Amino acid sequence: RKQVSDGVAHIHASFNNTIVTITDRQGNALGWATAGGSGFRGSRKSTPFAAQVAAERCADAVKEYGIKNLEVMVKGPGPGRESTIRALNAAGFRITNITDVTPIPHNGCRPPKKRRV
Amino acid sequence: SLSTEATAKIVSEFGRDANDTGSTEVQVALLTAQINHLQGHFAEHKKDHHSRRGLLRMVSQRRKLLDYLKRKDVARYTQLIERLGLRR
């Protein structure tokens, strides 16, 4: 089904799990893959390696469309922030662009408090 | 804060001449002018306390000036209250 070549790599790494979704130049998502979905529960997925295999997981599910090259928009800090884009490149994808889209509000909502540990 | 047009105008009505703004009558005159101007200013908003003390300071200022004038020459005092229109 289908046969694209240019897409996007919307990754969302956090302090718990890293979700990677390979979409097209339209933003409809062709296939995704999480660090937790491939196992690794708790601190297991809270590591850069969890995102590494996660990328390969999303890769081995989107190549069915013949995705040659695709952009990469990083979102959310935490682990698997750099190792993630380091996988797609080694997966055989022609990296083109890499832009950051981490939601940065100009001081609006009021963040939580409870964290006394 | 009271255009320079009104200020110079008042000075040439109470004092012997121009540049005589230092006169007691001139001061109490230019002060009351604002007290009546800002009078309408506070008529609106009414939530401007910071600028309220200023108006009060202006009145409390002329008030002490009246006691002084009334202290020295009494005639100049009456001829001022009836003209300027105040004290009741």
């Binding site: 800090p77 884009i85 662009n97 950051d100 981490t102 009021r110 963040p111 | -």
Partner: protein, 51 residues
Amino acid sequence: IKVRENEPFDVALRRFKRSCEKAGVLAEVRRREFYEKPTTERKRAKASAVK
């Protein structure tokens, strides 16, 4: 923020984040709101910036 590499290389080389955003302004507006407490912190650090 963004990087448009040339051709002869694949390495990230995106060490720009470690000089602006990344966490220099993210970690700040992450935990407590502080408010007036920062002043004491900056004043304390500024007191150690002399010697």
